[PDB]
Structure formats: C-alpha cells, structure tokens
Design an enzyme around this catalytic site. Structure first.
Site, PDB file in Angstrom:
ATOM      1  N   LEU A 107      -7.816  -3.746  -3.072  1.00 31.98           N
ATOM      2  CA  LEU A 107      -8.282  -4.294  -4.349  1.00 31.98           C
ATOM      3  C   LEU A 107      -9.572  -5.072  -4.098  1.00 31.98           C
ATOM      4  O   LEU A 107      -9.602  -5.960  -3.242  1.00 31.98           O
ATOM      5  CB  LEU A 107      -7.230  -5.236  -4.942  1.00 31.98           C
ATOM      6  CG  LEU A 107      -7.649  -5.899  -6.256  1.00 31.98           C
ATOM      7  CD1 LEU A 107      -7.840  -4.898  -7.360  1.00 31.98           C
ATOM      8  CD2 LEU A 107      -6.622  -6.948  -6.692  1.00 31.98           C
ATOM      9  N   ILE A 138      -7.969  -6.775   0.817  1.00 30.23           N
ATOM     10  CA  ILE A 138      -8.962  -7.204  -0.158  1.00 30.23           C
ATOM     11  C   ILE A 138     -10.280  -6.543   0.207  1.00 30.23           C
ATOM     12  O   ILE A 138     -10.734  -6.627   1.358  1.00 30.23           O
ATOM     13  CB  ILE A 138      -9.098  -8.731  -0.204  1.00 30.23           C
ATOM     14  CG1 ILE A 138      -7.742  -9.388  -0.481  1.00 30.23           C
ATOM     15  CG2 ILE A 138     -10.122  -9.108  -1.279  1.00 30.23           C
ATOM     16  CD1 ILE A 138      -7.022  -8.868  -1.709  1.00 30.23           C
ATOM     17  N   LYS A 139     -10.882  -5.877  -0.766  1.00 28.19           N
ATOM     18  CA  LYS A 139     -12.129  -5.156  -0.580  1.00 28.19           C
ATOM     19  C   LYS A 139     -13.318  -6.055  -0.929  1.00 28.19           C
ATOM     20  O   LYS A 139     -13.374  -6.666  -2.010  1.00 28.19           O
ATOM     21  CB  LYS A 139     -12.106  -3.865  -1.403  1.00 28.19           C
ATOM     22  CG  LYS A 139     -13.381  -3.032  -1.285  1.00 28.19           C
ATOM     23  CD  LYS A 139     -13.431  -1.734  -2.093  1.00 28.19           C
ATOM     24  CE  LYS A 139     -12.585  -0.636  -1.514  1.00 28.19           C
ATOM     25  NZ  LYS A 139     -12.911   0.663  -2.162  1.00 28.19           N
ATOM     26  N   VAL A 140     -14.248  -6.156   0.024  1.00 31.07           N
ATOM     27  CA  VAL A 140     -15.347  -7.106  -0.017  1.00 31.07           C
ATOM     28  C   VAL A 140     -16.624  -6.348   0.340  1.00 31.07           C
ATOM     29  O   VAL A 140     -16.693  -5.753   1.418  1.00 31.07           O
ATOM     30  CB  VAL A 140     -15.131  -8.247   0.990  1.00 31.07           C
ATOM     31  CG1 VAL A 140     -16.362  -9.138   1.095  1.00 31.07           C
ATOM     32  CG2 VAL A 140     -13.882  -9.057   0.635  1.00 31.07           C
TER      33      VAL A 140
END
EC number: 2.2.1.2
Length: 352
Positions: A107, A138-140
């Site tokens: 996400l 977590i997509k960064v």
C-alpha cells in the site's frame, strides 16, 4: 500453461499481481491465485482509482462512509486499508510458508508526501499500524526523501516497497540506506530477520520515453539492459563483505522487483519484459493482462543474467547518443509522481 508460475518460482523469482480490488478478494479469486503460483500483490493510486471507479462492491462502502464526518482522504484510506488487510489475510499462509519471504501486499503513501521524509515516515508508520498485518509492505517513492524515510522505517522494523526507481545510482543509494537501518537494529539487539524490502525498478516507461528517437538496434532494448545492469550491481553490493557481515546476523537482502512490466508498444511481444527478466532472488509484479499472457505463451528461463556484455555495450551506446540515463531516471520518477498524484486526486473527487 499455469505451471509456468511454479517454474519461475523454481528459478528464484516471485510473480506478484499488480492489481487489487474489493471484488478480487471477496470473490475468492485472490485466494485461488495464491494457491496456484501468484506470490504477492502490489497497489498504487492509479490501481485504486480504477478499482474504486469500476468495482461495484465499493458503492455501498462509499455510501456508508459518506454518512460519517470524514475527509475524502480518510474515506479512501478506510476503503484501501480494508482491501489490503483482507488481501494480507488471503496471502498469510503463503507468507508463513516461506518464513515471511513471500506473500506480501503493498500500500502506497500519499504522493504529496514524496519529498517530505518526516511526513512519509509518519504516514508509513501509521498505515503499517492501520493494516495491522506482518505481510504488508508500505510503498514509498524512491526520491531522496524516500530513501531518508526508508532508513528510518527499516530501523523501526517496517517492511517497505521502494517504488519509482529508474536509476542504478538511486537504487544503490537505497541499498546503503537499508543497510544503515539494519545495522542500527543489530547494534541495538533488535530483530531483523522478518524485515523485507523490495526495490521496484520500472521497465516499460524507459522504452516508452526513448524508443521513438533511438536507432533500430536499440529500440525496445534499453529498459532490459538497465535492469540487467541493476541486477549485476545487486549481486556485487549484497555479496560484498560489508553486507555479508549483516546477512550472517540474520539480515535479508533487498530484492529487485521489476514493475511497469506490461508491454506498452504493440511492436513488442506482450511477454517481453517478464520473459526477459527472470533471475534468482527477484520479483516481477504484473498487471492482469500480462499475467494472462505469460501463462498462455510466456517462457520460464533464467534470462536476467544472460548476455550481460550486450547490456553493457547497449548502455554505452545510449550514452554515446547523448541519452543520460540518470537525467532520464529523474524525469521519469517526476513524471510518475505527477501521474500518481493525478490519479489520487481523481479518486478523491467522488469521495467528497
């Protein structure tokens, strides 16, 4: 046929689905995929924009959330976090079967935070807690601020999908930040063995940017050559004594993940990127139509490390032509952030 997915896993690459929706999970389809060779899921704001607009199962959820005093972003997050948590539960058996090495769902944080390291850390920590699943990433975005945030998040024990990489130099910077965060945990006596990070290196966008102006022998070749060279860099970095000292203590290597692997030029076979980028300890996240095509007529062979000399020669010619792949990478990352922000704004408007 379907067994190609298992054959690719035997070659050391995981295939993930680059799509997510409420119906994909609720219908049982995702669970059936996870039993039959798909190993994970990625999302992004464009994926959610399309899902929210097209999937009938959101209508009642939006109606319910519009009866609450919530911002549009909060409404979006309630929807998306629920989808991600449900997908995580579907993928949990796979994740636990490999000791936490597969079965992830990603996400992405809000695009507007991409150049704010502290804000990125705050949102990533919060979304990690909100999903409340060990197999969520977590997509960064891999901006400089994102790499700052990566180090902090790794030191916090959070698994991260670093996205919008188009640069070998920026990827190496990400590896160094990861290693610093791991080293900080080891020094404090904290666990590292379940922290997983992928470096999502985008493919088709490179060819889309360059091909119209490249000579014949280079059209459709640059993205694959860059990926091959990135994988060579990966082998060098992670086998070096510095990283080996961390891996001996339980650290996991970052893994390269090939994204933007749907073919966007009909002059190239639809399985070009999947077929060409298979190698050990990597991931390829594919949109539905590309997964379909690969099952139907893809080929499982260890292609990623083949013909590295030709990749080096091609990249030398790209430079000879005056294409600076580092300048290109920055522009593509900027393009991609603008595109993701546009998609995000487009999905928020119906949630007002």
């Amino acid at each position: 046929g379907m067994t190609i997915l298992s054959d690719v896993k035997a070659l050391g690459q995981q295939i993930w689905l680059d799509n997510l929706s409420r119906s994909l999970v609720q219908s049982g389809e995702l669970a059936q995929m996870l039993k039959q060779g798909v190993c994970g899921v990625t999302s992004n704001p464009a994926i959610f924009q399309k899902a929210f607009a097209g999937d009938a199962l959101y209508a009642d959820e939006v109606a319910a959330l519009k009866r609450q005093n919530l911002s549009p972003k909060q409404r979006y997050e309630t929807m998306a976090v629920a989808d991600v948590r449900a997908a995580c539960d579907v993928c949990l058996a796979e994740h636990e079967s490999t000791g936490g090495k597969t079965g992830f769902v990603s996400l992405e944080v809000s695009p507007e935070l991409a150049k704010d390291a502290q804000g990125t850390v705050e949102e990533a920590r919060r979304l990690h807690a909100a999903i409340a699943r060990k197999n969520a990433m977590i997509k960064v975005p891999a901006t400089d601020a994102g790499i700052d945030a990566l180090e902090t998040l790794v030191s916090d024990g959070i698994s991260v999908n670093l996205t919008l990489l188009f640069s070998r130099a920026q990827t190496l910077k990400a590896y160094a930040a990861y290693a610093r965060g791991i080293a900080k945990r080891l020094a404090a006596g904290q666990s590292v063995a379940h922290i997983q990070v992928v470096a999502s290196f985008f493919i088709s966008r490179v060819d889309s940017a360059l091909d119209a102006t490249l000579p014949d022998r280079l059209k459709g070749k640059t993205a694959i050559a860059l990926a091959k060279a990135a994988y060579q860099d990966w082998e060098q970095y992670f086998t070096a004594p510095e990283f080996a000292a961390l891996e001996a203590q339980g650290a996991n290597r970052v893994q390269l993940l090939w994204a933007s692997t749907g073919v966007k030029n009909p002059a190239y076979p639809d399985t070009l990127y999947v077929d060409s980028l298979i190698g050990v300890h990597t991931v390829n996240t594919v949109p539905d139509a590309t997964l379909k095509a690969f099952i139907d007529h893809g080929t499982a062979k260890a292609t990623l490390t083949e013909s590295a000399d030709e990749a080096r020669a091609r990249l030398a010619e790209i430079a000879a032509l005056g294409i600076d792949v580092e300048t290109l990478a920055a522009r593509l990352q900027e393009d991609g952030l603008k595109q993701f922000e546009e998609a995000f704004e487009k999905l928020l408007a119906p949630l007002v």
